[PDB]
């Protein structure tokens, strides 16, 4: 709501932005269009029902501008819950006039917020610039994850057995050096630690179940 | 001979002072310089995100290419960026707004961004301005709105700006730039840098010492070991130049011992002792009353930690139950009594030398603490036979 | 410990633990008033009256400290600059002032306690050593600080806790009602102390004293038992 | 003579021992450390003759000589500068706790060098363009910072940019990063701070048993007032605790005060006795819990007795306030007192709540008060049966 109200200040009314709260700007723009009877403004707002204005504080701001006949509001509705964003206390100002529209054409613009999956180039370009000893650790936890995935009570491997497996596969040598190798993994949103009740920091990978299954096929070369 | 002359000149070349070396970095540098030649000649402009390796010292690589373009072509101007003194996400655009066209400058008037900065860039009569970007990940916000205007300028009308971002690898295009994998207008370019293994760390040292020194001070067997573990952590150039320079001053200090009062080859044993206090535990030096490890009043408390793990199947304890185990073993052994009024200071005392750790809690006593690693370190190398030998056999 | 600073230049910092302003304020203020009889030091040593109950942060404490010294400003307070040079050959003529704190509980849980670390460095600086004597009700205070402040303390505290009973407790009840020789007539002063002795040994008066002594043996719990009876006397 | 008491000259022996034992009246520094002072001597000397800049980060608890040994490093270099040996330097000092905001460090640096004072942004921008000035000579300055954890911010733009300054061309900054433990760069600080720094972290170990008896001997070289059996006894307890250099001389000062309490007699003893060494341990490490039950009344000791009786047949250390009131009347009626009223239940709790000996939330849930003993449950039984 700040990118629309503050955009008609230094462009339509020619005034720099200096308001305080939200209610301070609402009652300041009404006096500019009430005393003057020659300031028309057409609002060709597209898709009014987006996804970040479902609160009741968003329609009460635009509802005040609808009381004046000098302000024109043109909005589009693309949802079956049209009267869910306004009640009887707001229809007196807007005075909606319904007009059915039949176009039959797909959408190729706003399709971006929907969840696709994750880009495979991120998991591929992260191992090329990674130390050789760290790649063997990432390829070792993925093997024990799919073999124990059938168990519904999978809480993750502990830290004692993880430290023993390192020297069994010629990896890390000490403990403080092993914790330093997990710094670039927790910052890249690959693994995270949880406050376990048994005093053991669990190790899990918050990704999709189908993503780890397609990682062993690209490392065959 | 030239003994004192070689040591006073070796510390200058081994110190981390703008390592602007050309060898050992061929295919990682020619692609960067050739990418800018097509934009200055072909009248093109786009974006270029450089995702460097976390901590490898590549800031001197970009400075070499920028100074070579000044001597080749004369007419363009390059503005630098140093946002290290900007703790907030704002106050970044006005910081670089005072450099319009070198000799032609202006003055700010308060609240005037996104209007005059992008206006002079679209002017075709001006030269090709090159803007440098650094630590772009630290300029994020709650909705990274400040990063939505600097990545769309070389893609709208009049594209006359090349984006060069020098930053290490922390996160790719997931939440910083949501335009990728969603919009088909922007087409950025990504170049990574793998960590330098022994094929580059050993090579970068041959042209570093043999060109400025007269005779080497170490053998060739010590080079293969120092360049082996430095590439296992990250592969930083400063870490490789510091692990070798520090191993020389410890040997040079031993030269002035019953010699000057009235070159040599540094062995491999003199290098392992320097990294001994980095990853190795300092629990061996404890003879002749040398206080280089553990005093006394702390070993009688940490010895009871394993006595509670094998009985409760848990590795976490607290300050409350720690005094209960100490109040029982003191009355049956007649030792020094330590009240719990000063036992909390011992919790903020046993953290160095790579041992147990803890966190911060508001209330006392009830403090969730844990242990680092306990397996086999109390025998062989450590005594624990005549001191706390009767404690482990008691319970 | 007080004579090591006023007569010489050795500052000491101790911790007095007790009840509140009715019991802990019976020894520190009495030692400071003892310095008044000797006028060759009372005129060269001032006193700053601080209270931790009023201060809640750290930025405010950097401005209200100048309201007690008044050596470089006026009713007005100088620039907002946080104090940096707080004036610290071990022999100066700038009149050394001793600071007095109170209630180590409010500012004890602020931000690493950046105010107490300054007072611990002035006595260990190089100019004039300045001591610090405070009051607190909580028992253990030493462990309530970080390791950078724990290793830089005197580790000297006295537990001012009363340990009376019943025979020696009656003397406290009669000492508070023993007014000094200030009455215009000495005849009425003799019957005042004698009437208390007749009521000190009674089957009903001793029962009230032992009932309040078991609940709270602090001297503050007895203050209400001596002023309420005076209101009835008209 | 302006002041009426301009330092009275100690005419005795016990009054003179405090001058050589004071933390401020030190003729030099703490000895028994030549293998470490010589190592840092050749390091700082190699930087002034090279006209470059480096970093330095030590480790150790705040009490091993980090405030006394660093002063002799400057006192020895200033003597050679006057004899045309080493280039001149500038003395810069700054503490991490003297500044409230962690971003005000740019004000003390600009004011120390020149005289202009700005802020954290107006000054922080001039110092960045001054270090990279091409064609301007500088001096081999020294940067001494203390307590690095207070300067840690969320963006990590305080410790990272500070280490990149002496890594330029015309940069002669010698950073003396002083902290506590050595695992700070690999715990609180992240990757960028630990990368541009180096593995040149030489920790300082505490003094040994043979070193504490020598430092105290240098201060008492001509002080015939302490026996040889009492000096080694005080230096023995501190050597087993943590080896702190500040926890040894403070106990000796207490020995100089406990002996004066016996000097009120007409006899004037010379050396100390064996009783002064035993009393210097209990008074130094006093307990704030064994004296609470001894000096208690009758209702206070009976209220704490019923707490352990309810935590025996349940096995849980958490209970309510309504359950503790039921068994409190049983112990009060057996000894010979009437039932306690309800209004006084918060009065006896405010006494223990003021001293915070019983962790409990404030007066919000009077019937749901969480009982949390500050001490254990076995130590209160031995201190109660002593009466």
Give a three-class secondary structure readout of B313-381: CCCEECHHHHHHHHHHHHHCCCCCCCCCCCHHHHHCCCCCCCCCCCCCCCCCCCCCEECCCCCCCCCCC
Cα(C24)–Cα(C12) distance, integer angstroms: 18
Positive or negative, the CA dihedral C2, C6, C11, C17 is positive
Paired strand residues for C100: C49, C133
Cβ contact A53:A3 at 8 Å: no
Distance CA A40, CA D259 (A): 96
**Residue in C157, B213, B206 with CA at minimum distance from that of residue D283:** C157
Distance CA D149, CA A79 (A): 53
C19 is in an annotated binding site: yes
3 state SS of B192: strand
Interface contact C111, partner B, CB < 8 A: no
Closest approach of D194 to chain B, Cα-based (Å): 9
Is residue B132 a contact partner of residue B164, using CB atoms and an 8 Å limit?
A: yes
Gap between the Cα atoms of D376 and D311, Å rounded:
12
Nearest to C157 among D286, D292, D294 (CB): D286
Cβ atoms of residues D30 and D245 within 8 Å: yes
Burial class of residue B196 (count of CB atoms within 10 Å of its CB; 0-12, 13-18, 19+): buried
Q: What span, in angstroms and rounded, lies between the C-alpha atoms of B268 and B279?
A: 17
Positive/negative CA dihedral, B350, B353, B358, B361 = positive
**What subunits touch chain C, counting only 3 or more CB pairs under 8 A?**
B, D
User: Positive or negative, the Cα torsion across D12, D13, D16, D18?
Assistant: negative
Q: Chain D within 8 Å of B239 (Cβ-Cβ)?
A: yes
Phi and psi at residue B12, to the nearest 5° = -75, -40
Element (DSSP H or E) covering residue B164: strand B161-168
Chain A residue nearest residue D190, CA to CA: A183
> Cβ atoms within 10 A of the Cβ of A14, count?
7
Q: By the 8 A CB rule, do A66 and A33 touch? A: no
Neighbours of D45 (CB within 10 A): 16
Q: Determine the Cα–Cα distance for residues C16 and B188; give it in Å rounded to an integer.
A: 68
How far is residue D367 from each of residues C215, D311, D332, measured CA to CA in Å?
Answer: 20, 18, 20
**How determined?**
cryo-EM
β-strand D358-359 against D372-373: which pairing, if any? antiparallel
Query: Would you call B345 and C147 a contact, using CB atoms and an 8 Å cutoff?
Result: yes
Alpha helices, H only, chain D: 14-21, 34-48, 69-81, 105-113, 122-131, 160-163, 191-195, 209-219, 228-241, 246-258, 275-282, 290-294, 299-310, 321-335, 345-354, 379-382
Up-side HSE of residue B4: CA atoms within 13 Å toward CB? 4
Q: Do A176 and B279 touch (CB under 8 A)?
A: yes
Instruction: Give the strand order in the sheet containing B78-79.
Output: B78-79, B129-134, B161-168, B49-52, B190-192
Contact of D209 with D236, CB cutoff 8 Å: yes
Q: How far apart are CA B143 and CA B154, in angstroms?
A: 22
Q: Is C165 annotated as a binding residue?
A: no
Distance CA D261, CA D68 (A): 32
3-state secondary structure of D145: strand
Nearest-angstrom CA–CA distance, A7 and A16 = 10
Annotate B349-363 with b (16+ C-beta within 10 A) or e (fewer): bbbbbbbeebeeeee
What does chain C come to in residues? 234
CA distance D172 to D165: 9
C6 secondary structure, DSSP code: I
The 8-class DSSP code of residue D369 comes to P
A184: contact with D, CB 8 A cutoff: yes
- Joined together, the tokens standing for residue B167 give 């930053």
Q: Structure tokens of C223?
A: 């203050």
Question: How many helices and strands, by DSSP H and E, does chain A display?
Answer: 10, 2
Structure tokens at B261: 């009062």
Contact D183 A176 (CB under 8 A): yes
Q: Which H or E run includes B166?
A: strand B161-168
Question: Strand A41-44 vs strand B129-134: parallel, antiparallel, or unpaired?
Answer: unpaired
What are the CA-CA distances from residue D279 to residues A205, B330, C156, D228, D330 (Å)?
59, 20, 13, 17, 43
User: Considering Cα of A47, then A51, then A53, then A54, what sign does the dihedral take?
Assistant: positive
- A129, A163, A176: residue with CB nearest B195: A129
Would you call D360 helix, strand, or coil by DSSP? coil
Task: Enter the tokens of residue A38.
Answer: 């020659």
CA distances from B39 to B34, C81, C208, D83 (A): 9, 51, 99, 59
Unique residue bearing structure tokens 């490898």: B56
A135, A127 in Cβ contact below 8 A? Answer: yes
- C-alpha distance from C233 to closest chain D C-alpha (Å): 28
Q: In terms of DSSP bridges, do strands B49-52 and A71-74 run parallel, antiparallel, or are they unpaired?
A: unpaired
Contact criterion met (CB < 8 Å) for B289 and D198 = no
- Touching subunits of B (3+ CB pairs, under 8 Å) are A, C, D
Close Cβ partners of C95 (under 8 Å, ≥ 6 residues apart): C44, C45, C46
Whether the Cβ atoms of residue C103 and residue C136 lie closer than 8 Å to each other: yes
Q: Cα C158 to the chain's mean position, in Å?
A: 13
User: Please, is A127 exposed, middle or buried when counting C-beta atoms within 10 Å of its C-beta (0-12, 13-18, 19+)?
Assistant: middle
Backbone angles phi, psi at A41, to 5 degrees: -155, 115
Q: If residue B78 lies in a helix (H) or strand (E), which one and from where to where?
A: strand B78-79
Whether C175 and chain B come into contact, CB under 8 Å, resolves to no
Rounded Cα gap, residues B104 and B116, in angstroms = 14
Cβ <8 Å between B342 and C146: no
The first and second tokens of residue B347, run together, are 């919790």
Q: Would you tell me which residues 30-59 of chain D have a C-beta closer than 8 angstroms to some C-beta of chain C?
A: none
Q: Structure tokens of D16? A: 């003179």
CA atoms within 13 A on the CB side of D39: 18
Residue B270 per-residue DSSP state: H
d(CA B181, CA B198): 37
Give the closest-approach CA distance of D13 to chain A in angstroms. Answer: 53
Contact state of C151 with D98 under an 8 Å Cβ cutoff: no
Q: Where are the beta strands (DSSP E) in chain C?
A: 13-17, 46-49, 97-100, 132-136, 157-159
Which one-letter DSSP state was computed for residue D81? H
Exposure of A16 in the CB half-sphere (CA atoms within 13 A) = 6
DSSP letter at A205 equals -
Closest CA to B141 of B132, B133, B149, B129: B149
**DSSP string computed for D283-335:** TTT--SSHHHHHT--SHHHHHHHHHHHHTTSS--S---HHHHHHHHHHHHHHH
Beta bridge pairs of residue D101: none
CA atoms lying within 13 Å on the CB side of residue A166: 18
d(CA D120, CA D105): 7
Q: Residue D231: which of D11, D21, D19, D13 has the closest Cα? A: D21
Resolution stated for this PDB structure, in Å: 6.7
Q: How far apart are CA C52 and CA C109, in angstroms?
A: 12
Q: How would you write D233-272 as a 3-class SS string?
A: HHHHHHHHHCCCCHHHHHHHHHHHHHCCCCCCCCCCCCCC
Residue D142: burial class (beta carbons within 10 Å; 0-12, 13-18, 19+): buried
How far apart are the C-alpha atoms of B127 and B125, rounded to whole Å? Answer: 7
Residue D63 among known ligand-binding residues: yes
Q: Which residues contact D147 (CB under 8 A, 6 or more apart)?
A: C148, D95, D96, D97, D178, D179
Residue D62, class by beta-carbon neighbours within 10 Å (0-12 exposed, 13-18 middle, 19+ buried)? buried
Q: How far apart are CA D190 and CA D184, in angstroms?
A: 9
Query: CA-based angle A33:A36:A38, to the nearest 5?
Result: 95
Say if the Cβ atoms of D191 and A176 lie within 8 Å: no
CA distance B308 to B321: 10
């Amino acid at each position: 709501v700040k990118s629309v109200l503050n955009s008609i200040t230094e462009e339509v009314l020619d005034h720099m932005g200096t308001f305080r709260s939200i209610l301070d700007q609402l009652d300041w723009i009404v006096n500019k269009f009430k005393e003057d009877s020659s300031l028309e403004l057409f609002l060709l707002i597209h898709n009014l029902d987006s996804q970040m204005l479902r609160g009741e504080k968003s329609q009460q701001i635009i509802g005040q501008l609808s009381s004046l006949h000098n302000i024109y509001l043109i909005a589009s509705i693309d949802h079956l819950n049209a009267p869910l964003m306004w009640d009887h206390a707001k229809q007196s100002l807007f005075n909606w006039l319904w007009y059915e529209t039949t176009t039959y054409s797909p959408y190729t613009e706003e399709t971006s917020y929907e969840n696709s999956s994750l880009p495979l180039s991120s998991l591929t370009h992260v191992l090329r610039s990674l130390t050789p000893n760290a790649r063997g650790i990432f390829r070792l936890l993925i093997k024990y994850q799919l073999d124990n995935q059938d168990n519904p009570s999978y809480i993750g491997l502990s830290f004692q057995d993880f430290y023993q497996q390192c020297r069994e596969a010629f990896l890390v040598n000490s403990d403080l050096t092993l914790r330093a190798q997990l710094t670039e993994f927790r910052d890249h949103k690959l693994i995270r630690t949880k406050k376990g009740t048994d005093g053991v920091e669990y190790l899990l990978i918050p990704v999709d179940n189908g993503t780890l299954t397609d990682f062993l096929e690209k490392e065959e070369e | 001979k030239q003994e004192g002359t070689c040591y006073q000149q070796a510390k200058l070349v081994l110190n981390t002072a703008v390592p602007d070396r050309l060898p050992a970095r061929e295919r990682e540098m020619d692609v960067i310089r050739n990418f800018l030649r097509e934009h200055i000649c072909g009248k093109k402009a786009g974006s270029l995100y450089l995702s460097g390796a976390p901590g490898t010292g590549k800031t001197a690589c970009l400075s070499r290419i920028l100074q070579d373009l000044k001597k080749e072509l004369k007419g363009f101007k390059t503005i630098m960026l140093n946002c290290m003194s900007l703790r907030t996400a704002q106050a970044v655009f006005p910081a670089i707004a005072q450099e319009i066209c070198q000799e032609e400058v202006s003055r700010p008037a308060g609240k005037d961004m996104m209007r005059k900065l992008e206006k002079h860039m679209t002017a075709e009569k001006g030269p090709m301005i090159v803007l440098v970007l650094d630590e772009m990940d630290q300029l994020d916000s709650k909705g990274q709105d400040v990063l939505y205007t600097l990545f769309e300028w070389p893609w709208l009308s009049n594209s006359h700006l090349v984006l060069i971002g020098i930053a290490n690898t922390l996160d790719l295009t997931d939440r910083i730039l949501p335009r990728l994998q969603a919009r088909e207008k922007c087409k950025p370019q990504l170049l990574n840098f793998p960590p330098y293994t022994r094929n580059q760390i050993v090579t970068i040292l041959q042209d570093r010492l043999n060109q400025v020194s007269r005779d080497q001070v170490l053998d060739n067997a010590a080079v293969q070991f120092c360049a082996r573990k430095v590439s296992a952590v990250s592969g930083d150039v400063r870490k490789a130049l510091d692990v070798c320079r520090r191993a020389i001053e410890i040997v040079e200090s031993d030269v002035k011992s019953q010699t000057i009062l009235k070159p040599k080859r540094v062995g491999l044993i003199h290098i392992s002792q320097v990294i001994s206090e980095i990853d190795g535990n300092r629990m061996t030096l404890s003879q002749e009353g040398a206080q280089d490890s553990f005093p006394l009043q702390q070993k009688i408390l940490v010895c009871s930690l394993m006595l509670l793990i094998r009985q409760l199947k848990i590795k976490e304890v607290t300050l409350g139950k720690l005094y209960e185990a100490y109040s029982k073993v003191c009355r049956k052994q007649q030792v020094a009594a330590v009240d719990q009024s000063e036992c909390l200071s011992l919790s903020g005392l046993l953290e160095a030398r790579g041992i147990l750790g803890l966190k911060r809690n508001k209330e006392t006593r009830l403090t969730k603490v844990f242990f680092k690693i306990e397996e086999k370190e109390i025998e062989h190398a450590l005594k624990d036979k005549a001191l706390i030998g009767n404690i482990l056999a008691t319970g | 410990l007080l004579k090591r600073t006023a007569l010489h230049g050795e500052s000491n910092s101790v911790l007095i633990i007790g009840p509140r302003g009715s019991g802990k304020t019976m020894l520190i203020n009495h030692a400071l008033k003892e310095l008044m009889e000797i006028e060759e030091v009372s005129e060269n040593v001032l006193q700053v009256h601080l209270n931790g109950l009023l201060q809640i942060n750290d930025k405010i404490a950097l401005k209200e400290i100048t309201r007690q010294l008044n050596l470089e400003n006026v009713v007005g307070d100088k620039v907002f600059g946080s104090f940096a040079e707080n004036l610290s050959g071990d022999r100066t003529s700038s009149c050394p002032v001793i600071f007095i704190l109170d209630e180590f509980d409010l500012f004890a849980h602020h931000k690493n306690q950046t105010l107490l670390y300054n007072l611990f460095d002035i006595s260990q600086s190089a100019q004039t050593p300045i001591a610090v004597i405070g009051l607190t009700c909580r028992l253990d205070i030493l462990e309530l600080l970080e390791k950078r402040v724990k290793s830089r303390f005197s580790h000297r505290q006295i537990h001012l806790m009363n340990s009376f009973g019943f025979p020696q407790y009656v003397k406290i009840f009669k000492e508070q009602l023993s007014l000094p020789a200030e009455f215009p007539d000495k005849v009425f002063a003799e019957k005042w102390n004698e009437n208390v002795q007749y009521l000190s040994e009674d089957r009903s008066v001793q029962e009230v004293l032992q009932k309040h002594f078991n609940i709270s043996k602090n001297l503050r719990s007895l203050h209400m038992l001596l002023m309420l009876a005076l209101n009835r006397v008209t | 003579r302006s002041r009426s008491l301009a330092a009275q000259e100690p005419a005795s022996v016990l009054e003179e021992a405090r001058l050589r034992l004071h933390v401020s009246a030190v003729p030099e520094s703490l000895p028994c450390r030549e293998q470490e002072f010589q190592d840092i001597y050749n390091f700082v000397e190699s930087k002034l003759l090279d006209h470059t800049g480096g970093c330095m980060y030590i480790s150790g608890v705040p009490g091993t000589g980090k405030t006394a040994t660093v002063h002799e490093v400057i006192r020895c270099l200033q003597q050679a500068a006057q004899a045309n040996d080493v280039p001149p330097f500038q003395y810069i000092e700054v503490n991490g706790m003297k500044l409230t905001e962690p971003h005000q460090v740019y004000v003390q640096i600009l004011q120390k060098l020149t005289g202009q004072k700005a802020t954290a942004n107006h000054a922080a921008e001039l110092l960045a363009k001054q270090f990279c000035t091409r064609g301007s000579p500088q001096e081999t300055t020294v940067l001494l910072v203390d307590e690095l954890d207070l300067l840690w911010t969320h963006k990590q733009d305080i410790m990272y940019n500070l280490f990149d300054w002496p890594t330029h061309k015309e940069a002669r900054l010698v950073v003396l990063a002083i902290a506590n433990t050595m695992d700070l760069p690999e715990r609180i600080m992240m990757n960028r701070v630990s990368s541009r720094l180096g593995l040149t972290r030489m920790c300082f170990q505490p003094y040994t048993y043979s070193q504490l008896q020598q430092i105290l001997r240098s201060r008492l070289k001509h002080l015939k007032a302490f026996e040889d059996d009492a000096i080694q006894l005080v230096a023995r307890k501190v050597a087993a605790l943590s080896g702190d250099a500040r926890r040894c001389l403070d106990i000796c000062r207490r020995a100089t005060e406990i002996c004066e309490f016996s000097q009120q007699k007409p006899d004037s003893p010379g050396l100390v006795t064996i009783a002064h060494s035993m009393e210097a341990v209990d008074e130094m490490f006093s307990s704030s819990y064994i004296t609470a039950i001894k000096n208690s009344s009758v209702l206070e000791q009976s209220f704490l007795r019923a707490i352990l009786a309810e935590f025996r047949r349940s096995g849980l250390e958490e209970a309510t306030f309504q359950q503790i009131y039921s068994q409190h009347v049983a112990l009060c009626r057996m000894e010979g007192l009437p039932y306690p009223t309800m209004s006084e239940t918060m009065a006896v709790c405010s006494h223990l709540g003021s001293c915070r000996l019983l962790l409990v939330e404030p007066s919000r849930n009077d019937l749901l008060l969480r009982v949390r003993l500050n001490v254990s449950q076995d130590d209160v039984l031995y201190a109660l049966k002593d009466e």
